[PDB]
Amino acid sequence: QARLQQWEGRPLKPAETLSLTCGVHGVGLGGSGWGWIRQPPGQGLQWIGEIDHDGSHKHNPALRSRLSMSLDTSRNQVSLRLTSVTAADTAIYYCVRVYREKFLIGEFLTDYRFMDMWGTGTTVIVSASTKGPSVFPLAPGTAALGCLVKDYFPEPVTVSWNSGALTSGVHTFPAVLQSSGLYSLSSVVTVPSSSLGTQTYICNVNHKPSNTKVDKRVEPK
Amino acid sequence: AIQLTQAPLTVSASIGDTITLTCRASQDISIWLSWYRQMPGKAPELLIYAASTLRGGVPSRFSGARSGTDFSLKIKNLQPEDFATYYCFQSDSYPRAFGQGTKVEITTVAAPSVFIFPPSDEQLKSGTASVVCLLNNFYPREAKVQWKVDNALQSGNSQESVTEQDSKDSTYSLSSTLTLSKADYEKHKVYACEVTHQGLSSPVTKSFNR
Amino acid sequence: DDMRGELKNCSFNMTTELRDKKQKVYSLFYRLDVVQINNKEYRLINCNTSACTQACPKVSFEPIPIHYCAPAGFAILKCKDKKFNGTGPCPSVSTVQCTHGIKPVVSTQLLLNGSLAEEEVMIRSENITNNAKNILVQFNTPVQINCTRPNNNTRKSIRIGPGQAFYATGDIIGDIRQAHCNVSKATWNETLGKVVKQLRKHFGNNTIIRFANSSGGDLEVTTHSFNCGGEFFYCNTSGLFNSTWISNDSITLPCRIKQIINMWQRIGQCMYAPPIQGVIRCVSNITGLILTRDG
Amino acid sequence: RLINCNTSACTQACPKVSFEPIPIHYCAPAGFAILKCKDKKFNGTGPCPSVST
Ligand SMILES: *[C@@H]1O[C@H](CO)[C@@H](O[C@@H]2O[C@H](CO)[C@@H](O[C@@H]3O[C@H](CO[C@H]4O[C@H](CO)[C@@H](O)[C@H](O)[C@@H]4O[C@@H]4O[C@H](CO)[C@@H](O[C@@H]5O[C@H](CO)[C@H](O)[C@H](O)[C@H]5O)[C@H](O)[C@H]4NC(C)=O)[C@@H](O)[C@H](O[C@H]4O[C@H](CO)[C@@H](O)[C@H](O)[C@@H]4O[C@H]4O[C@H](CO)[C@@H](O)[C@H](O)[C@@H]4O)[C@@H]3O)[C@H](O)[C@H]2NC(C)=O)[C@H](O)[C@H]1NC(C)=O
Ligand SMILES: *[C@@H]1O[C@H](CO)[C@@H](O[C@@H]2O[C@H](CO)[C@@H](O[C@@H]3O[C@H](CO[C@H]4O[C@H](CO)[C@@H](O)[C@H](O[C@H]5O[C@H](CO)[C@@H](O)[C@H](O)[C@@H]5O)[C@@H]4O)[C@@H](O)[C@H](O[C@H]4O[C@H](CO)[C@@H](O)[C@H](O)[C@@H]4O)[C@@H]3O)[C@H](O)[C@H]2NC(C)=O)[C@H](O)[C@H]1NC(C)=O
Ligand SMILES: *[C@@H]1O[C@H](CO)[C@@H](O[C@@H]2O[C@H](CO)[C@@H](O)[C@H](O)[C@H]2NC(C)=O)[C@H](O)[C@H]1NC(C)=O
Ligand SMILES: *[C@@H]1O[C@H](CO)[C@@H](O[C@@H]2O[C@H](CO)[C@@H](O)[C@H](O)[C@H]2NC(C)=O)[C@H](O)[C@H]1NC(C)=O
Ligand SMILES: *[C@@H]1O[C@H](CO)[C@@H](O[C@@H]2O[C@H](CO)[C@@H](O)[C@H](O)[C@H]2NC(C)=O)[C@H](O)[C@H]1NC(C)=O
Ligand SMILES: *[C@@H]1O[C@H](CO)[C@@H](O[C@@H]2O[C@H](CO)[C@@H](O)[C@H](O)[C@H]2NC(C)=O)[C@H](O)[C@H]1NC(C)=O
Ligand SMILES: *[C@@H]1O[C@H](CO)[C@@H](O[C@@H]2O[C@H](CO)[C@@H](O)[C@H](O)[C@H]2NC(C)=O)[C@H](O)[C@H]1NC(C)=O
Ligand SMILES: *[C@@H]1O[C@H](CO)[C@@H](O)[C@H](O)[C@H]1NC(C)=O
Ligand SMILES: *[C@@H]1O[C@H](CO)[C@@H](O)[C@H](O)[C@H]1NC(C)=O
Ligand SMILES: *[C@@H]1O[C@H](CO)[C@@H](O)[C@H](O)[C@H]1NC(C)=O
Ligand SMILES: *[C@@H]1O[C@H](CO)[C@@H](O)[C@H](O)[C@H]1NC(C)=O
Ligand SMILES: *[C@@H]1O[C@H](CO)[C@@H](O)[C@H](O)[C@H]1NC(C)=O
């Protein structure tokens, strides 16, 4: 039942303070050490920093002077206060417990820290103001059709087809972050070409952050 | 700092195989190197610490070795839950570092079905044009899309996105968007996406005339 | 074989700075400081005899030279004779205002640091023919002895009351080899050769001079007890004194460590030497010996 | 809890002893003298032309 719970902080404007908080349940802040691990999309994990059992703050050299962490012993919470957040800092932030086990090499005893327990994930995205998407048709043996869901902020958008009745052959792609700071994604479906003039195809786009719902009929041009 | 090199970056095997993953360090980090597995969309979890000790609950199939520079992890009796991204993390020097990540997936070679979509007239009223190329149901994941406009090779004005591996046929799909100004879009006639893939003996081009 | 075989991981309830609240704490106590009561139940060794005033952490045990100076109307006569054993006329005398800096180095079986002899090893006994009298050997060339406690100790602070803190060994990592002292085997062999040469003058040229190790008694008297780096060592010195004399290499002396010290051969006044953070290293000169002869 | 219980324990001021300042006279031993500057505009430093013992 020992878990580390952290909650979403919503998208934040660039050049601000990034305040994270991890909830430690099952175990307590004492005795172990608590650190932060991120993961930029489509990339590997990156070490930000840790507080060791001694109360000493190891920080990554790349993030210079913009790092600051603290431990709330009373509330059992670990905090991160990254400042001057740039667009390159868009990553999922994890809270970890670096646990110390002593391993005996031939004559030497070491404290080995191995990040025992991981958080759940806090997707942090920096851009832009809330904006609903514009939905454009991708118009058509087998034919492909789809919808282009362009220029929205923040994530996420969901897409279904024919109110969920059409699932075979559907591919909804990961969004990309455009150079504008707005996201775009596409959803497609492959269908029998013979059905294009008779069966109606509607992509159901939902962008919860802006309360935007679009049901876009995709007809051949 | 210490740099961990993990190769191969993508190893494919079917259910019930044995794989070995390599993580090469820069210096000698003794045996302090732990292994983490990240299921797609989930959080990473500890598999092996000190390069040999199994975490409580990890099946005995997982195993590591070596205490020098070429650390290795061996998986036996592959199951669908093992097809994730593995990371090696050193704990010798305080500038901590992670591996690049080895994406383990399931292994038929199949060329994409390719489709091209012109921008909608509704979008064009906005001053910008998106041309979309779909590569459907292909394996392996590696694919190359080249956009051409009146036969001129485009560079720097496209972005692409790939699905997760399909659970039933092990294929991928890819979507690439070429972004042009309306003014540029209306100065040219032939819009083409050229696709290179292992399943194709020569590139496939889908095109339209504006 | 390790340092960790000398330690007990002892957990106890301690008072807090608030009188009505307790504190479940733990510390690593040496097996020489805990006595079992009949996770077993133990207690500190000097607890039925006294309470241990903690060695105050801001005062150093390093000996500084002190000069004993005579008041008005008195003079201190200094014997400048280089062959003066300890008794009888001294042809060369001087009146010093007061003595040279005498470092109060506290040690047993070996006179660490201090003053060397001038020309040759000096044997000094109250009555050399009486085996109940100690023999004070003084070297002319010092024998360097190197200490160590290889462990990287982690001192931990416990608040046992308002303003009072108890410093405890929380964790021990690093090199876990037993604390030891190294004496050069070549230098010690030639120093005992000089001691034996000056010791046959009182017992005969054809006599057999044999060095054995300490007979028995307290750990403070059977071992080379001393202080080094604020932590108290008790070295075996059974490889130092093991030889029979007929008419790069080093000697490693396994040393134990204690934290509860009854220093001046007294009962009822102990002292708790707090843990020293880090690795302890030691360089001393063996400038003498204290020997006893067998009847 | 009392403001000073993590620094020290506090000695109760004894109820019969008095904190009222009583004038005290600092007197020099034999062979010493106390020189008093009787200048009325002395600024605490410098030669005082009106000195008394
Ligand atoms: C000398 O003796 C000493 C003993 O006298 C030795 O010290 C002990 O060393 C132990 C081994 O290193 C160590 O055990 C480890 O404890 C971990 C939890 O940490 C504890 O204990 C600390 C004691 O200082 C506390 O400071 C922590 O706060 C924590 O205790 C928490 O405290 C909470 C209150 O704050 C309690 O209440 C929870 O509070 C929450 C608040 O939101 C919620 O309300 C919860 O509902 C509520 O319960 C907690 O109950 C309590 N938790 C306890 C008691 O666990 C523990 O995680 C370690 O075990 C796990 O990890 C190791 C490594 O992987 C595994 O081998 C274990 O099997 C276990 O793993 C399993 O769980 C993890 C998740 O935790 C999974 O990831 C894993 O897959 C497994 O499923 C371990 O038990 C002792 O704590 C420590 N004790 C002391 C007094 O310091 C000392 O080492 C020795 N020295 C020498 C030199 O020999
Ligand atoms: C033996 O074991 C001990 C532990 O018992 C080791 O001591 C620790 O070493 C690590 C580095 O190896 C230290 O971590 C660093 O902390 C400094 C700043 O530390 C300051 O603040 C600490 C918390 O208050 C404090 O403990 C520090 O030490 C003082 O106080 C202790 C008593 O508590 C005393 O014993 C010491 O002598 C000091 O007076 C100190 O005030 C931090 O700058 C370090 O650098 C990291 O982070 C930066 C960015 O901030 C990054 O750029 C660097 O690359 C790096 O990541 C690091 O956090 C730890 O503080 C030490 N702990 C103690 C208790 O002293 C010891 O090294 C081991 N020795 C051997 C021989 O192996
Ligand atoms: C510290 O004190 C607690 C009680 O405050 C001790 O725990 C008790 O131990 C006795 C056995 O001797 C049990 O009968 C009680 O039920 C325990 N009470 C609890 C657990 O609340 C504990 O043993 C003490 N620790 C020491 C002396 O190291
Ligand atoms: C205090 O307790 C210690 C430990 O029990 C006593 O020393 C023990 O005395 C018995 C009886 O002679 C011996 O068998 C043990 O070997 C002794 N133990 C140690 C560690 O020396 C000591 O006598 C007690 N002191 C007083 C004043 O009662
Ligand atoms: C004998 O003298 C030496 C030299 O003074 C002592 O070693 C010094 O100890 C102090 C305090 O621990 C250190 O600051 C110095 O750096 C040490 N010097 C060297 C050269 O190591 C040594 O402790 C003395 N032996 C005793 C007191 O038994
Ligand atoms: C001190 O050293 C001596 C000698 O090494 C140790 O005691 C003897 O060791 C020899 C072999 O090393 C054994 O044959 C004897 O039986 C030992 N005598 C004993 C144990 O009484 C001794 O253990 C060392 N330490 C102390 C504290 O004496
Ligand atoms: C004793 O406790 C007091 C009260 O907590 C400490 O004074 C506080 O120190 C913190 C800094 O962490 C300040 O934020 C508070 O404002 C201080 N309190 C007051 C009333 O000024 C004090 O430092 C402690 N002293 C020791 C030696 O531990
Ligand atoms: C010490 O030397 C003096 C003078 O040489 C001598 O008389 C005396 O006997 C010596 N001491 C002993 C114990 O013999
Ligand atoms: C003593 O000598 C041993 C090897 O004989 C060596 O390992 C150790 O470091 C030395 N210790 C000191 C304090 O010189
Ligand atoms: C003692 O240590 C010193 C350096 O601190 C070294 O030069 C010397 O050789 C050592 N001697 C012995 C006997 O260990
Ligand atoms: C002296 O050495 C003998 C063995 O040589 C050992 O049994 C005895 O305990 C030693 N005495 C000490 C170190 O006081
Ligand atoms: C030992 O004595 C020599 C000179 O005989 C001196 O140079 C050295 O510093 C001394 N070592 C100590 C006091 O640790």
Side-chain angles (χ1 to χ4, degrees), chain A residues 1-2 4-9 11-15 17-63 65-74 76-80 82-207 209-218 220-221, chain B residues 1-124 126-140 142-143 145 147-167 169-186 188 190-210, chain C, chain D:
Chain A
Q1 53 86 27
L4 273 75
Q5 291 180 356
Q6 61 183 176
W7 302 270
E8 296 175 354
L12 295 176
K13 299 296 186 290
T17 56
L18 188 60
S19 294
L20 271 296
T21 289
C22 183
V24 182
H25 313 119
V27 296
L29 296 178
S32 301
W34 306 88
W36 291 94
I37 309 295
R38 75 175 61 183
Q39 187 178 4
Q43 297 180 51
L45 285 80
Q46 182 176 1
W47 186 68
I48 297 89
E50 73 195 20
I51 306 100
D52 280 333
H53 66 281
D54 29 39
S56 306
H57 290 245
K58 318 287 171 300
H59 288 125
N60 198 57
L63 302 173
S65 297
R66 54 181 290 176
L67 285 172
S68 66
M69 291 172 285
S70 67
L71 295 156
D72 205 291
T73 65
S74 62
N76 269 11
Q77 274 176 356
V78 191
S79 87
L80 181 55
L82 196 55
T83 76
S84 178
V85 178
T86 310
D89 293 332
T90 297
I92 307 101
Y93 282 53
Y94 298 81
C95 55
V96 289
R97 184 172 77 158
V98 291
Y99 187 74
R100 299 177 296 110
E101 200 139 329
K102 296 175 191 177
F103 283 88
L104 185 51
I105 314 299
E107 202 64 38
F108 206 82
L109 205 60
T110 64
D111 278 332
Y112 177 49
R113 293 84 181 265
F114 55 91
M115 295 193 293
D116 202 2
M117 270 200 310
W118 288 76
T120 310
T122 296
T123 63
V124 164
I125 299 169
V126 288
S127 294
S129 290
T130 308
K131 176 175 172 333
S134 292
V135 180
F136 303 121
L138 300 165
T142 305
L145 58 112
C147 284
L148 179 54
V149 183
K150 212 189 126 72
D151 290 349
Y152 63 91
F153 179 85
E155 289 265 74
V157 152
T158 58
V159 181
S160 71
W161 284 88
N162 288 354
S163 298
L166 177 55
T167 58
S168 318
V170 169
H171 294 296
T172 300
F173 291 87
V176 295
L177 180 55
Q178 311 166 99
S179 56
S180 64
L182 302 182
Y183 294 84
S184 175
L185 68 72
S186 65
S187 182
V188 301
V189 58
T190 49
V191 297
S193 311
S194 64
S195 75
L196 289 178
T198 48
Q199 171 77 59
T200 299
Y201 295 104
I202 297 164
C203 73
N204 318 108
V205 176
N206 176 43
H207 184 237
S210 67
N211 281 312
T212 297
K213 297 181 316 133
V214 177
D215 297 330
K216 178 60 72 156
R217 284 185 65 121
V218 183
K221 197 150 163 333
Chain B
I2 305 179
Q3 281 101 25
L4 296 167
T5 298
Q6 192 172 3
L9 279 78
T10 294
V11 65
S12 86
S14 166
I15 292 166
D17 295 332
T18 52
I19 309 176
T20 298
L21 291 78
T22 69
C23 177
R24 181 179 176 89
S26 69
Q27 321 162 4
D28 207 307
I29 56 165
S30 180
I31 211 165
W32 324 131
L33 181 135
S34 57
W35 287 92
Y36 303 97
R37 170 179 53 181
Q38 172 155 9
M39 188 74 74
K42 320 279 210 78
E45 66 178 2
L46 179 65
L47 293 176
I48 309 296
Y49 55 103
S52 300
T53 305
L54 266 72
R55 202 260 311 254
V58 178
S60 315
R61 51 178 177 171
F62 288 92
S63 179
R66 188 77 179 92
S67 66
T69 287
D70 291 331
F71 299 86
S72 69
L73 186 143
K74 295 171 73 67
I75 318 164
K76 281 85 168 182
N77 194 33
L78 288 176
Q79 307 285 275
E81 80 263 355
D82 300 352
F83 297 130
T85 307
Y86 299 82
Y87 296 87
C88 58
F89 171 77
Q90 63 93 23
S91 313
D92 196 351
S93 295
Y94 274 130
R96 296 286 196 264
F98 286 88
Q100 292 100 41
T102 290
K103 279 82 173 175
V104 182
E105 79 273 14
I106 193 166
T107 53
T108 306
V109 172
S113 284
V114 183
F115 307 84
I116 187 161
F117 299 99
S120 64
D121 292 318
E122 175 190 358
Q123 184 183 18
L124 286 181
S126 82
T128 296
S130 298
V131 198
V132 176
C133 188
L134 165 70
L135 282 57
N136 210 42
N137 293 358
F138 59 89
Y139 179 87
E142 289 73 38
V145 177
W147 286 98
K148 295 151 163 153
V149 177
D150 278 348
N151 306 110
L153 227 50
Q154 300 305 105
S155 178
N157 50 359
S158 59
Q159 303 181 276
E160 77 184 16
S161 158
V162 189
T163 59
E164 295 307 317
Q165 188 168 45
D166 184 274
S167 63
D169 68 14
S170 295
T171 63
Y172 297 88
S173 295
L174 179 153
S175 179
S176 174
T177 303
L178 176 76
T179 296
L180 299 165
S181 67
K182 169 183 225 243
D184 270 345
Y185 180 68
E186 307 212 310
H188 299 282
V190 179
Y191 290 82
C193 59
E194 188 185 26
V195 170
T196 305
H197 185 268
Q198 171 184 351
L200 297 165
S201 295
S202 66
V204 176
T205 301
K206 287 308 180 217
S207 67
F208 63 83
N209 287 12
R210 178 187 42 81
Chain C
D1 293 332
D2 295 328
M3 185 64 72
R4 291 177 308 133
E6 192 179 356
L7 293 169
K8 299 283 294 199
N9 190 359
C10 293
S11 164
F12 49 97
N13 285 297
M14 188 46 73
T15 59
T16 312
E17 309 188 298
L18 298 186
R19 187 193 61 193
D20 53 312
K21 301 290 179 67
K22 293 298 179 184
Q23 201 189 4
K24 186 78 178 299
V25 285
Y26 84 89
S27 176
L28 301 180
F29 290 114
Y30 289 104
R31 297 199 154 122
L32 282 78
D33 304 336
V34 287
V35 178
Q36 189 172 1
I37 305 166
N38 302 286
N39 48 0
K40 296 307 169 188
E41 294 178 355
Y42 288 72
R43 67 171 178 82
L44 283 180
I45 191 153
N46 290 318
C47 188
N48 58 348
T49 57
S50 61
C52 279
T53 187
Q54 170 158 246
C56 183
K58 288 183 183 177
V59 296
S60 188
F61 299 112
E62 182 60 35
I64 64 169
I66 58 178
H67 313 250
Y68 275 94
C69 314
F74 291 85
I76 294 174
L77 294 192
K78 167 174 163 190
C79 175
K80 292 205 303 197
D81 197 16
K82 297 183 188 295
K83 293 194 285 185
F84 187 50
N85 62 7
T87 301
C90 173
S92 296
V93 176
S94 297
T95 295
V96 293
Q97 300 215 65
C98 64
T99 80
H100 69 296
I102 295 148
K103 287 196 300 308
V105 179
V106 181
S107 74
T108 74
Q109 297 199 354
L110 299 175
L111 308 175
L112 293 179
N113 288 339
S115 58
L116 277 296
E118 276 299 296
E119 69 178 11
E120 188 59 30
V121 161
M122 292 302 299
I123 304 289
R124 292 170 173 116
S125 187
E126 183 158 2
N127 190 25
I128 199 69
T129 63
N130 192 6
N131 56 47
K133 296 291 161 176
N134 292 342
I135 294 172
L136 299 199
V137 187
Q138 196 188 27
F139 298 163
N140 62 338
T141 58
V143 183
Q144 171 153 277
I145 174 173
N146 292 353
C147 283
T148 199
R149 179 181 55 78
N151 300 101
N152 182 19
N153 192 352
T154 80
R155 164 189 287 193
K156 174 180 54 189
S157 297
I158 312 285
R159 267 81 206 180
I160 61 175
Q164 307 177 300
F166 167 64
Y167 299 105
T169 310
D171 192 358
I172 278 176
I173 51 170
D175 208 34
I176 56 184
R177 284 181 301 125
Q178 190 186 6
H180 57 269
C181 289
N182 289 353
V183 171
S184 189
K185 189 176 179 183
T187 303
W188 184 251
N189 199 57
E190 71 182 3
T191 299
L192 286 184
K194 295 191 269 181
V195 169
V196 160
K197 179 173 71 176
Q198 300 297 112
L199 198 58
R200 290 219 168 90
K201 298 181 179 189
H202 304 87
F203 301 101
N205 281 339
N206 296 155
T207 194
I208 306 302
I209 302 293
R210 181 197 152 204
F211 286 101
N213 68 306
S214 189
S215 176
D218 298 3
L219 193 80
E220 285 80 2
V221 75
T222 58
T223 64
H224 169 41
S225 164
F226 67 97
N227 190 336
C228 185
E231 207 171 14
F232 291 79
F233 284 60
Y234 294 87
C235 303
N236 208 3
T237 64
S238 286
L240 281 197
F241 304 117
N242 183 12
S243 181
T244 300
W245 298 80
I246 310 307
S247 296
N248 49 330
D249 202 0
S250 167
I251 299 170
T252 299
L253 314 169
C255 312
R256 310 271 274 289
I257 297 185
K258 281 171 44 196
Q259 300 198 246
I260 297 179
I261 320 290
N262 314 280
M263 175 172 278
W264 311 108
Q265 273 72 11
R266 71 182 66 182
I267 310 181
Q269 300 147 65
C270 60
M271 181 202 63
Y272 176 82
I276 298 294
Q277 183 67 41
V279 180
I280 280 175
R281 181 63 197 270
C282 203
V283 176
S284 307
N285 278 312
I286 309 172
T287 60
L289 298 173
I290 298 153
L291 304 171
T292 70
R293 203 179 44 99
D294 281 346
Chain D
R1 58 97 173 166
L2 287 174
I3 196 156
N4 280 308
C5 279
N6 58 307
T7 61
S8 61
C10 309
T11 318
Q12 182 170 237
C14 202
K16 293 298 179 184
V17 307
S18 193
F19 296 121
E20 176 69 8
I22 289 175
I24 65 186
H25 305 270
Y26 279 98
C27 313
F32 291 83
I34 289 180
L35 300 179
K36 169 178 162 194
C37 173
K38 289 201 295 195
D39 191 15
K40 291 180 177 65
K41 59 178 69 177
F42 194 42
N43 68 321
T45 309
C48 176
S50 183
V51 177
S52 72
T53 294

